[PDB]
Ligand binder design. Structure first.
Ligand SMILES: CNc1cc(N2CCC[C@@](O)(CNC(=O)c3ccc(CN4CCC(C)CC4)cc3)C2)ncn1
Ligand SMILES: [Mg+2]
Ligand SMILES: [Mg+2]
Ligand SMILES: [Mg+2]
Ligand SMILES: [Mg+2]
Lengths: 198, 236
């Protein structure tokens, strides 16, 4: 359970029913802006992943609107929106009309989550831009304080995103690495030969 | 390092720790081009918006939301969505809609679409708390407000950082006017739900709490009749 787990896969075709239920879902999708088409995004089997809990959905450009669509489509209500203010190592700030100083993360809720620590953190992140397309590590702290110890799943993560209590899905991860006994069982039953295709 | 952990430890919001050519010509040409301030007391709920002519190049829309009075007439998004904004917007024009930080982030986007705009920017007003270290649905402590920019028809960053105003003070940062003005979108600029305290050269202010009016549609239109009809507001 607790240590990092991941699955190299195409999230369009993985049968995520084998993974169980999660208290938090995070997704950093490759939106078709300026890649997954809008219809592929809509059809992701997000709804099987949670009964009660929160989704964190990174958005940019016209995905600020499309991501709201998917959010409601998948059965969530948007109840918050986090912005990461991007700075340099000296704590200064680093889509025509305006230059962009921030990235947006929608926060959706599904069901009636209980036992979460709402209101410990504020809705702003100030953190240094490390690598291009590298999300700030503070989000995992906010998410852990919000729901400590619970199961979490990240979609479209990269190898640097693997964290304890998290399962990371992405098409540039190194193989399959699963340790939760229930997951390992249902993965073997669904994929006896270790291949993920249709 | 981790300013979110630091905010949990001390109560200093992460934005407290943000630090810090010549776009002065723009602002000087704005000033030479600006019309005199015009303003009109009007109960916008009961007011036929079509009497505000000519069509506007820019609309700043600042409805008084209940969330602005937490510990202190409020407009709901129901009221706001029913404004006939499309009837006064020029066929190419821009809107800036203050949406708060709750459901307005969604309902203000429905408004923009209803009035025929597409959202091109999301301007965040990030409020620091250096001088003083929840909604039921909230997951996090809300320390910002959003002003959505919309465009219909065919310099600056999208962040404003200021100290959080005192309780009961509903003013938005005057920085929003510089962002709008720096665009040079045209000279017909309308501020709906402005106040005595927001009246400004280059702008027609309309709101219920204004104590005086000087608006005259013919006088106002004379500011933009030939040869002045298409100036950006950033020329001689
Ligand atoms: C075809 N189906 C796929 C596709 C797929 N991916 C496609 C290939 C890369 C992938 O593997 C790793 N994700 C990224 O690199 C990635 C990185 C950055 C961003 C944008 N961010 C926005 C928010 C900000 C905090 C950070 C910037 C978006 C994605 C994901 N993974 C599984 N199935
Ligand atoms: Mg933009
Ligand atoms: Mg990192
Ligand atoms: Mg924070
Ligand atoms: Mg200026």
């Amino acid at each position: 359970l607790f240590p990092p787990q991941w699955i190299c896969c195409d999230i369009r075709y993985l049968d995520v029913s084998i993974l169980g239920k999660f208290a938090v879902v995070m997704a950093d999708p490759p939106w078709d802006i300026h890649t997954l088409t809008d219809d592929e995004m809509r059809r992701l089997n997000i709804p099987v992943l949670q009964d009660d809990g929160f989704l964190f959905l990174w958005v940019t450009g016209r995905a600020m609107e499309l991501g709201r669509e998917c959010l409601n489509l998948w059965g969530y209500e948007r109840v918050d929106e986090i912005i990461w203010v991007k700075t340099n190592q000296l704590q200064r700030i680093i889509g025509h009309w305006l230059n962009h100083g921030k990235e947006h993360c929608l926060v959706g809720v599904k069901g009636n989550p209980q036992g979460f620590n709402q209101g410990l953190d504020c809705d702003v992140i100030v953190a240094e831009v490390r690598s291009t397309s590298h999300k700030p590590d503070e989000i995992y702290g906010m998410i852990e304080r919000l729901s400590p110890g619970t199961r979490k799943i990240e979609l479209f993560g990269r190898p640097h995103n693997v964290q304890p209590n998290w399962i990371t899905l992405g098409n540039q991860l190194d193989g399959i690495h699963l340790l939760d006994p229930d997951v390992v069982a249902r993965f073997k039953q669904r994929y006896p030969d270790g291949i993920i295709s249709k | 390092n981790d300013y979110c952990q630091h905010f949990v430890d001390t109560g200093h919001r992460p934005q407290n720790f943000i630090r810090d050519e010549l776009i002065r010509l723009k602002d000087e040409l704005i000033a030479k081009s600006n019309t005199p301030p015009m303003y009109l007391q009007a109960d916008i709920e009961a007011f036929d918006i079509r009497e505000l002519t000519p069509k506007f190049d820019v609309i700043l829309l600042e409805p008084p939301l209940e969330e602005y009075y937490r510990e202190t007439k409020c407009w709901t998004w129901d009221d706001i969505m029913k404004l006939e904004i499309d009837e006064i917007a020029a066929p190419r024009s821009f809107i800036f809609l203050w949406c708060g930080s709750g459901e307005g982030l969604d309902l203000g986007r429905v408004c923009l679409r209803k009035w025929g705009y597409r959202r091109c920017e999301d301007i965040c007003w990030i409020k620091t708390n250096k001088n003083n270290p929840l909604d039921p649905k909230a997951v996090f402590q809300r320390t910002k407000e959003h002003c959505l920019m919309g465009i219909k028809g065919t310099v600056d960053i999208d962040l404003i950082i200021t100290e959080e105003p005192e309780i009961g003070n509903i003013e938005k940062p005057v920085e929003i006017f510089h962002i709008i003005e720096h665009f040079c979108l045209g000279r017909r600029r309308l501020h709906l739900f402005g106040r005595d305290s927001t009246i400004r050269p280059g702008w027609l202010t309309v709101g219920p709490t204004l104590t005086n009016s000087n608006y005259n549609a013919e006088t106002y239109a004379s500011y933009f009749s030939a040869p002045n009809s298409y100036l950006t507001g950033c020329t001689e």
